[PDB]
Amino acid sequence: FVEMVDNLRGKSGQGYYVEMTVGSPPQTLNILVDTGSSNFAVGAAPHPFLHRYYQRQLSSTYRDLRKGVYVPYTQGKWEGELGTDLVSIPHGPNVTVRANIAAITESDKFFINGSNWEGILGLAYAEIARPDDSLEPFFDSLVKQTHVPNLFSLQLCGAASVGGSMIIGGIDHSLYTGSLWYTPIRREWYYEVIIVRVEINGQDLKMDCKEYNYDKSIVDSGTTNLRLPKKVFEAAVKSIKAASSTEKFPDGFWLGEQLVCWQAGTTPWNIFPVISLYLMGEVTNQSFRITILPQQYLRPVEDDCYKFAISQSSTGTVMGAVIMEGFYVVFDRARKRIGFAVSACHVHDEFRTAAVEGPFVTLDMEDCGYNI
Ligand SMILES: COc1ccc([C@@]2(c3cccc(-c4cccnc4F)c3)COC(N)=N2)cc1
């Protein structure tokens, strides 16, 4: 899959995007890769932040579905017009599919002033598609219309320009070391998983594990932070504070309300703890653990200073870029599971590495999931 290596680009905090073509003749667009949503949705009007946009009038293969879509959300809204067209991925498999496209005609706080992308590829499942699960997601269409195996993997590398790989239809073993460890996709809507235990420097937080997944835990390439439920965040910060007593920091830093700075190349990673999440394993009573360094949760702010990239949530646990940048992540849809291996590109130092380890014995893992 050499042709797909390094097919992702981005800027810090603005997401990872892949090049796509839409319409006939092909219109090239940069499209954000989002495992936390399920619509393929592209700018279709000359919004001043956009480098380019889908011009339906120029596409012979375009088909109007004569339906609108309106999507408010936590941090903004978009609206648009549903249709289909021929879609390809130049640095992907050599195929062209007929996919649903939401042509975005109005938005608020959706596009980023300064970014180099113009749409979103929602890679999650039909159930959370807008307006409803009848709007077939892109990857479902890809699998139905081609022999592309039903899986994709992501290597998000970080550093200010970032890069990575989306391997569509498979796995490239040079992008990770050690073994892949798999967690079950609990339900096919978001990529929901179950976290069964949490450690800060080997120290168990000792919370009821249902709190780790209240009301949801997901793997989301479209979220920057590691986001934790309010209660879990509270306990986690308290233990991180304790473990890092050597220096002191204002309450605003932990809350993501201000930054903290050092001199160039003198940053003291060693006084910050590793964070370990144990995930439900493939077998009854078996778990495994993924561990990240402060290089994953203390993120450079250029516009050496750093922001604390763990934050509180009311939507559940969100394993965003902070987690994903430590690992090669395999979205093995064919087998309803997600694999984690140590990433060949993750940022580390001479003392500590991001790690994926197992097996461990963990009882009552099913009880850690939230039910309505
Ligand atoms: C279908 O409607 C939506 C609404 C919001 C999204 C976002 C989204 C929309 C726009 C931008 C971004 C974004 C911003 C910064 C960095 N990375 C991103 F993915 C994220 C929000 O959460 C996730 N996972 N995707 C996707 C689809």
Read off the tokens for 130.
């807008």
Q: How far apart are CA 42 and CA 119, in angstroms?
A: 4
**Cis ω on the peptide bond leading into residue 294 (within 30° of 0)?**
no
Encoding tokens for residue 38? 């399920």
Written as one string, the DSSP assignment of 240-263 is HHHHTTTS---HHHHTTSS-EE--
Helix (H) or strand (E) holding 318: strand 317-319
- The method recorded for this entry reads X-ray
Cis amide prior to 131 (ω within 30 degrees): yes
Q: Is the alpha carbon torsion for 94, 100, 104, 109 positive or negative?
A: negative
Cβ neighbours of residue 57 closer than 8 Å, sequence gap 6 or more:
none
CA of 204 to the centre of ligand 1 (A): 32
Distances in whole angstroms, Cα of residue 151 to Cα of each of 140, 154, 169, 297, 336: 10, 10, 5, 28, 10
Query: Which residue's structure tokens are 């200073």?
Result: 305
Return d(Cα 192, Cα 368) in angstroms, integer: 13
Which of 73, 109, 190 most suits a substitution to test ligand 1, by most atoms within 8 Å of the C-beta? 73
Active site residues: 34, 220
Residue carrying structure tokens 């940022």: 347
Closest CA to 83 of 68, 59, 63, 105: 63
CATH code reported for the domain at 149-372: 2.40.70.10
Bridge partners of 305, per DSSP, are 261
The protein residue whose alpha carbon is closest to atom 25 in ligand 1 is 222
* Sheet strands side by side (includes 260-261): 260-261, 305-308, 298-300
How far, in Å, from the CA of 102 to the mean position of ligand 1?
A: 14
- Strands, sheet with 226-229, edge to edge from the N-terminal-most edge strand: 217-219, 317-319, 226-229, 310-313
Q: Which residues pair with 328 in a beta bridge?
A: 155, 341
Residue 168 pairs in a beta bridge with 152
Distance CA 157, CA 96 (A): 28
Rounded-to-integer distance, Cα 356 and Cα 341, Å: 6
Question: Which residues on adjacent β-strands are paired with residue 72?
Answer: 77
Residue 58 burial (C-beta neighbours within 10 Å; 0-12, 13-18, 19+)? exposed
Other CB atoms within 10 A of residue 131 CB: 14
Q: Is 191 helix (H, G, I), strand (E, B) or coil?
A: strand
Atom of ligand 1 nearest to the CA of 38: 1
For residue 13, which atom of ligand 1 is closest to its CA?
Answer: 16
Instruction: List every span in the chain annotated with CATH 2.40.70.10.
Output: 16-148, 149-372
Distance in Å, CA 222 to ligand 1 centroid: 5
Lookup: tokens for 332: 């093995």
73 alpha carbon – ligand 1 mean position (Å): 9
Within 10 A of 177 (CB to CB), how many other CB atoms are there?
14
CB-hemisphere CA count at 13 Å for 326?
Answer: 30
User: Is 178:341 a contact under the CB 8 Å cutoff?
Assistant: yes
Residue appearing with tokens 């997401």: 15
Measured from the Cα of 222, ligand 1's closest atom is 19
Ligand 1 environment, Cβ below 6 A: 14-15, 32, 34, 36-37, 39, 71, 73, 110, 120, 122, 130, 220, 222-224
d(CA 41, ligand 1 centre) in Å: 11
57 by Cβ neighbours in 10 Å (0-12 / 13-18 / 19+) ranks as exposed
Ligand 1, atom 26: nearest CA belongs to which residue? 37
Q: Which atom of ligand 1 is nearest to the CA of 36?
A: 24
- Is the backbone peptide bond immediately before 215 cis, with ω within 30 degrees of 0? yes
Which tokens sit at 135?
Answer: 């709007």
As a whole number of angstroms, the distance between CA 225 and CA 310 comes to 6
CATH architecture type of domain 16-148: Beta Barrel (2.40)
